[PDB]
Design a binder for this molecule. Sequence first.
Ligand code: IMI
Ligand code: IMI
Ligand code: IMI
Ligand code: IMI
Lengths: 123, 123, 123, 123
Amino acid sequence: AEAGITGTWYNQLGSTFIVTAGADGALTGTYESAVGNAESRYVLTGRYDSAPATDGSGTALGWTVAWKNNYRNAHSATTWSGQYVGGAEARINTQWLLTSGTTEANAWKSTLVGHDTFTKVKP
Amino acid sequence: AEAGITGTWYNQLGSTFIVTAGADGALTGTYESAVGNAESRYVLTGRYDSAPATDGSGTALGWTVAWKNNYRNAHSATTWSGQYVGGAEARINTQWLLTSGTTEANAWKSTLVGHDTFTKVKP
Amino acid sequence: AEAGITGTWYNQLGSTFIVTAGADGALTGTYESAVGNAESRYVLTGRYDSAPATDGSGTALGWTVAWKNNYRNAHSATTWSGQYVGGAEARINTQWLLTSGTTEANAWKSTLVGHDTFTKVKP
Amino acid sequence: AEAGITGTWYNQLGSTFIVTAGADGALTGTYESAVGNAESRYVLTGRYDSAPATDGSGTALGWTVAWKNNYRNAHSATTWSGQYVGGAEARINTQWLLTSGTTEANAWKSTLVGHDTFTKVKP
Ligand SMILES: N=C1N[C@H]2[C@H](CS[C@H]2CCCCC(=O)O)N1
Ligand SMILES: N=C1N[C@H]2[C@H](CS[C@H]2CCCCC(=O)O)N1
Ligand SMILES: N=C1N[C@H]2[C@H](CS[C@H]2CCCCC(=O)O)N1
Ligand SMILES: N=C1N[C@H]2[C@H](CS[C@H]2CCCCC(=O)O)N1
């Protein structure tokens, strides 16, 4: 975990994020897009649970990205919840929730759900 | 948003979190539990999209909490994705994903999904 | 369960569905809309698990509605997964997934997630 | 869609389901397990939206399985929401919700979320 989390990760769609896993569970870094209403890099912040594991279990973690930077403001934010598995072919398996700001009437259709798998190699 | 987000929020189950919404989209604070395998306060970090809105839309945001502190380590993390609506009865409506670290075989059952509504009054 | 499930149910948004819970776990009925890209009644089908419970637990169930009828074809389908709780104030608490048919490129944004609570009284 | 949906499908985990897509949007069939608290075949029922598509879009559909049969009763039900894509390498991409019946206190942790991809070839 931590040392093994730190670095660059890529997902199937081509997205890329670099993250630093700090000693006390913090995750900080940037997410650069590859396919949605995003354009360039965005700040990401999250946490991981720093004392994961005598039974080769994954390390739970999560992070958020608000889709606002100096070139674009999509009025939306995505959170990824998942776990890190290390080794030869280390990966971060996640499910994500993307919420867009809506008026009260359209709130029922504000959140999309999906999944993403990240690898250290692309892809 | 931001100023209106800053403060103490409570949900139906009794959970409480205090958050500070910084000028450039950051969210920092603590989450204290009221009903799960959590015990005390945990650090939370997230982001909100700081330039939300000529059509009274909500402000999208998200945050993460790794369930590890000095009294407990649940080997899990939760992410909340949702939006903030201000006014008389301001609230944060969210959907959440809670992932626990599992072995590769139990990964299919690692993530729970639910929703939470937070108010400035309890409840 | 079963006998207690059979009947008319209403949710917060105003939707209404009538369902018949058959002896061997079947659920059949119609869903009439109150607020989305639906107009009139749609067929619903699902199942419930018919032998639920010495510890007052809910009865798990789920059903699907394809948003196609003789007046509208939204090219989408919704599934509701949840449980039935009986008694004085019986209810069906669910989380739902609504998928729209997309081209392969927009598949990442094809599914919305939400929740609905149904009561025998409106609301 | 329909004719193309009818048949046997397999997912990564080894699960198998045979389904018949009827003329008016019905889906009927069985699901046989390969990896969870299921043992043998279970009845499945669902719907698909029968008039999908001049822009090669997927066909939205969904189905439910209550995990009760003559050998096992898991007191749970799963719903799969997704779309069918045909062609050379036809597939059904879905996200699923699995709800277990709980007491009112544990209801917050009753639903798991995941995804499954089915192919006509195994896998
Ligand atoms: N890597 C991924 N990219 C898309 C999904 C979840 S977040 C999303 C991109 C969203 C871009 C901003 C937007 O369109 O609002 N996974
Ligand atoms: N306010 C909420 N509390 C429960 C749900 C989502 S997070 C959860 C508490 C989890 C505590 C840690 C654990 O049990 O692993 N909403
Ligand atoms: N009772 C509810 N109505 C909306 C949510 C989930 S299903 C949805 C209505 C969808 C109508 C068809 C469509 O817009 O595609 N809950
Ligand atoms: N093909 C899949 N199998 C598991 C996931 C979702 S449904 C699940 C099997 C559940 C079996 C019954 C149970 O354990 O309660 N996908």
